[PDB]
Amino acid sequence: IPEKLEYFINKYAEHSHDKWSMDKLANGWIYGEIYSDSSKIQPLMLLSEKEKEIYRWPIKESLKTMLAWDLHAMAEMMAENYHNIWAKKKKLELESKGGGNHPLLVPYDTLTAKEKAKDREKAQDIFKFLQISGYVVSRGXXXXXXXXXXXXXXXXXXXXXXXXXXX
């Protein structure tokens, strides 16, 4: 957790709260201490106290995985991490309670497109703000080099052939 990014965490939390506020004012949500869903009344204007910070909490964790591990590659890796953390939580709870089998208990290269899009949405949401703030992030000629490698292999083969023809 870098110091300047730790500073920016609060500002990004505020910006995401403002975006969700625009969404909830488009939908219709007025502040009210009583908890309800059919009455369209919530005390944090259906995001509760902890529910408002559920998505803010793993931003720092995503940053730590970023540091511990170009742009599309980071997006797909962050999506993979978003699915891996949820898969670990789900498998842990199902092993704890001995429940049913979830169709999401499969490697990420098999999932349906919607299951990957769901986490890719949040991934791009957090990445666009990192891009606007000037944070250059990555994962962390070719034909000519290939031709050179081929030439070296050919030289080795020629050495071998000379050794063989010497006999």
Q: Which amino acid is at 161?
A: X
CA distances for 44 relative to 48, 52, 58, 117, angstroms = 6, 8, 20, 28
Tokens of 109: 């290269």
CB atoms within 10 A of CB 120: 19
Which residues does 101 contact at the CB level (< 8 Å), separation at least 6? 94
Contact yes or no for 123/82 (Cβ under 8 A): yes
Which residues have a C–N gap over 2.5 Å right after them in the chain?
45, 69, 140
Q: How was this structure determined?
A: cryo-EM
Q: Which amino acid is at 53?
A: E
Structure resolution, Å: 3.8
Q: What is the C-alpha end-to-end distance of the chain, expressed in Å?
A: 65
Q: How far apart are CA 124 and CA 120, in angstroms?
A: 6
CA distances for 67 relative to 43, 50, 96, 101, 122, angstroms = 37, 27, 32, 34, 19
Residue whose C-alpha is closest to residue 74's, from 18, 33, 133, 120: 120
Contact yes or no for 18/26 (Cβ under 8 A): no
